[PDB]
């Protein structure tokens, strides 16, 4: 329906810089605004942040100031501009795409990250 | 009202035609005035279009290309084409959209060679 | 598509109710199966019972239970505060021979988390363009449900005073608006549109209801506004000239 | 055991052919076809047996593997009704029905005479929203959310307002009161450039 492979990730030494694209494909005309959670070894998936199209940005306890999230428009990849690591951040990272048109979510494969030190 | 096309043929590649279209009635609706395009197995979709509102706008790669224009009267409307692509071969349906619907043509075939 | 029947057709609780899900089948066939079919997914099969007393587990199945007894029910039931159940509930029977399975109509089932939240869609009928009158000849009333949670209303739109199903269209599933939350509330609009004729015949009265499903009795409110009970909204509207 | 059905989706116009596949590794004995409308269950389209074989029943036609491996299931000249989730299945693996993912079918239809046009609904009563409708425009303009949030728009849908053989794509947006007009509700999707916005 839409469907959003998301791209780049892998491993990182703390304080790096990461930057996840998500490649959204397919109708995304849809989608409501986008969004990356991330869901760890023991847990349920914690919103990270989101943006919107046309573009805003919530952020999400977590890192709230030092994950930027963007987004562009052109390729329809949407960034997850992750300037700082600490090791309490490795999580799956999936990317989320949630319209208020039914089915109200899609979600896509999921990226690690994982950050040892 | 009715709208009377003229103007097709077959051509070559790399061709020169122009696709005109007779009318009748309002010219004190108007709203904007296209072409568009019927490729057997599609449906149709957008070629030209001339708006009161806005300019000319184009597009399908039959941008850099062809060009619409209309006349004074908007007693007629006229497609040029220029380089045909063999891609294009079709049966053109011409259209002027106006406040009371828009009204259509009965259409004409293009050839466009290999 | 069989003749089998599984009510009631919608169903509501608060988080932390059991409830059961009936299902009863009139032809004979030993195998009983059932659906949780979660939005825009495919089926899980969560138990079946081949015949009676044998039951064994689906794909899914942590934290529900369906007992046999009889070859013609088969009780689903539910046990709270699991994983938030709430998706579609589809049962199924077979004859075993070839494995060809027909289905029920089905159970939605919502569970919510707090119980404030539920309302009853308003809802109201947006009467039609004098512009898309003049210039499509035909008249789209659109009717904007608005407003309700959960998703498990079913509109339909009745105008002098029979229902029509005659260039009516819903929007097959509703819009949730803001999806990030859970326990939004939801709004549907659906179409009707007749020709201009008869949109501008005042003697018609188009309107469109919704059921709402909504709060049984014996839930507990305490809140201040009316408490929401499976209720009907309508709006309506005359046609009007021109 | 597993089997796998692609598409994940297809689209295809009214009236083209089409085809969705479905396969595995491991042979079955049986395999079946279901067409799933949304809360109506898998109803059964038919059931084929035997290697090769081939079932038409009507506009489907539906054929089996020879070794029993895959199995195809092509329309012929889709329509509207053919809108929908088409899920393959197979026996089990002690007797428990396997689900392809199934294709969702979107058939759209054939507007022939499209007319793209939003228009403003609205009302004498209460309620203080007030939505604009985009219809009659062409399968293939995809109708994007707002980036406002106050807007929504609803997804196409299309109507079959038979007797004149009419179908017609809409969507309709409403944005909360805001102070919207009409013209900026779907400046973010892109739009056909003949669509009649009306005074
Ligand atoms: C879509 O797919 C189908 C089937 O996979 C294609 O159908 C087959 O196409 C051929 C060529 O048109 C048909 O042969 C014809 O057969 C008869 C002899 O029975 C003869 O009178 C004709 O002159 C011609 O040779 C074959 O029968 C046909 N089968 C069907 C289902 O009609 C098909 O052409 C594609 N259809 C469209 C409309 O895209
Ligand atoms: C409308 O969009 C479809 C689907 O395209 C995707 O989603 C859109 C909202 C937009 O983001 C696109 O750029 C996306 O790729 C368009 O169909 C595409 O058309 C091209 C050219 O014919 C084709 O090669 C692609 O494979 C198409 N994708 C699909 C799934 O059909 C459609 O033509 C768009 N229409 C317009 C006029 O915008
Ligand atoms: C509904 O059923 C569930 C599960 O059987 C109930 O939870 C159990 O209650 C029994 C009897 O009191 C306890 O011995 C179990 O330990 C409980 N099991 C679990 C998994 O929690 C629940 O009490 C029932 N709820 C209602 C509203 O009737």
């Known amino acids: 329906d839409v469907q959003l492979v998301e791209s780049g990730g892998g491993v990182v030494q703390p304080g790096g810089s990461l930057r996840l694209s998500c490649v959204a494909s397919?109708?995304?005309?849809?989608?409501?605004?986008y969004g990356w959670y991330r869901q760890a070894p023991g847990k349920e998936r914690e919103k990270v942040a989101h943006?919107?199209?046309?573009?805003?940005?919530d952020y999400a306890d977590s890192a709230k100031g030092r994950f930027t999230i963007s987004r562009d428009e052109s390729k329809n990849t949407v960034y997850l501009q992750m300037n700082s690591l600490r090791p309490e951040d490795t999580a799956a990272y999936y990317c989320?795409?949630?319209?208020?048109?039914?089915?109200?979510?899609?979600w896509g494969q999921g990226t690690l990250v994982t950050v040892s030190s | 009202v009715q709208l009377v096309e003229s103007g097709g043929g077959l051509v070559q590649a790399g061709g020169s035609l122009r696709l005109s279209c007779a009318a009748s009635g309002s010219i004190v609706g108007i709203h904007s005035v296209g072409w568009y395009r019927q490729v057997p197995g599609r449906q149709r979709e957008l070629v030209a279009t001339i708006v009161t509102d806005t300019g000319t706008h184009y597009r399908d790669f039959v941008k850099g290309r062809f060009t619409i224009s209309r006349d004074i009267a908007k007693n007629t409307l006229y497609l040029q084409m220029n380089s045909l692509q063999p891609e294009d071969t079709a049966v053109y349906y011409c259209y002027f959209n106006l406040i009371r619907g828009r009204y259509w043509a009965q259409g004409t075939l293009v050839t466009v060679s290999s | 598509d069989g003749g089998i029947t599984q009510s009631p057709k919608y169903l509501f609780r608060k988080e932390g109710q059991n409830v059961t899900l009936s299902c009863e089948q009139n032809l004979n066939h030993d195998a009983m199966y059932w659906y949780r079919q979660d939005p825009g997914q495919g089926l899980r099969l969560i138990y079946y019972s081949q015949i009676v007393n044998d039951f064994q587990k689906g794909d899914i199945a942590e934290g529900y239970s369906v007992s046999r007894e009889k070859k013609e029910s088969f009780p689903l039931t539910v046990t709270s505060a699991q994983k938030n159940p709430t998706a579609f509930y589809l049962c199924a029977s077979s004859s075993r021979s070839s494995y060809e399975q027909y289905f029920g109509p089905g159970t939605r089932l919502t569970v919510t988390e707090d119980l404030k939240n539920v309302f009853p869609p308003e809802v109201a009928v947006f009467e039609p363009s004098e512009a898309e009158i003049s210039h499509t000849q035909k008249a789209t009333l659109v009717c904007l449900a608005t407003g309700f949670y959960p998703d498990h209303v079913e509109l339909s739109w009745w105008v002098n005073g029979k229902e029509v199903h005659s260039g009516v269209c819903t929007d097959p599933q509703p819009l949730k608006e803001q999806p990030a939350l859970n326990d939004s509330r939801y709004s549907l609009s659906s179409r009707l549109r007749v020709s201009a004729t008869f949109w501008q015949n005042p003697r018609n009265h188009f309107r469109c209801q919704v059921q709402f499903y909504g709060l049984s009795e014996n839930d507990e409110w305490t809140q201040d506004r009316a408490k929401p009970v499976t209720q009907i909204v309508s709006a309506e509207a005359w046609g009007r000239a021109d | 055991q597993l089997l796998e059905q692609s598409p994940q989706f297809l689209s295809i116009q009214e009236g083209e052919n089409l085809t969705v596949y479905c396969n595995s590794s491991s042979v079955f004995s049986s395999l079946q076809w279901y067409r799933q409308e949304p809360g109506e269950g898998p109803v059964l389209l038919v059931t084929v047996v035997t290697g090769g074989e081939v079932k038409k029943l009507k506009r489907l036609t539906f054929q089996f593997g020879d070794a029993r491996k895959d199995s195809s299931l092509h329309i012929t000249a889709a329509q509207p009704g053919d809108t929908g989730l088409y899920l393959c299945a197979g026996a089990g693996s002690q007797g428990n029905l396997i689900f392809g993912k199934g294709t969702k079918l979107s058939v759209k239809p054939n507007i022939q005479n499209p007319d793209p046009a939003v228009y403003q609904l609205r009302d004498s009563k209460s309620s203080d929203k007030s939505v604009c409708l985009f219809t009659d425009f062409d399968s293939q303009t995809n109708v994007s959310q707002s980036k406002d949030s106050d807007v929504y728009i609803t997804d196409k849908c299309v109507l079959d307002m038979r007797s004149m053989d009419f179908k017609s794509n809409s969507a309709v947006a409403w944005s909360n009161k805001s102070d919207f007009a009409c013209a900026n509700a779907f400046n973010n999707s892109i739009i056909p450039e003949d669509t009649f916005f009306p005074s």
């Open positions: 397919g109708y995304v005309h849809k989608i409501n605004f």
């Open positions: 943006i919107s199209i046309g573009d805003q940005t």
């Open positions: 989320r795409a949630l319209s208020r048109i039914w089915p109200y979510d899609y």
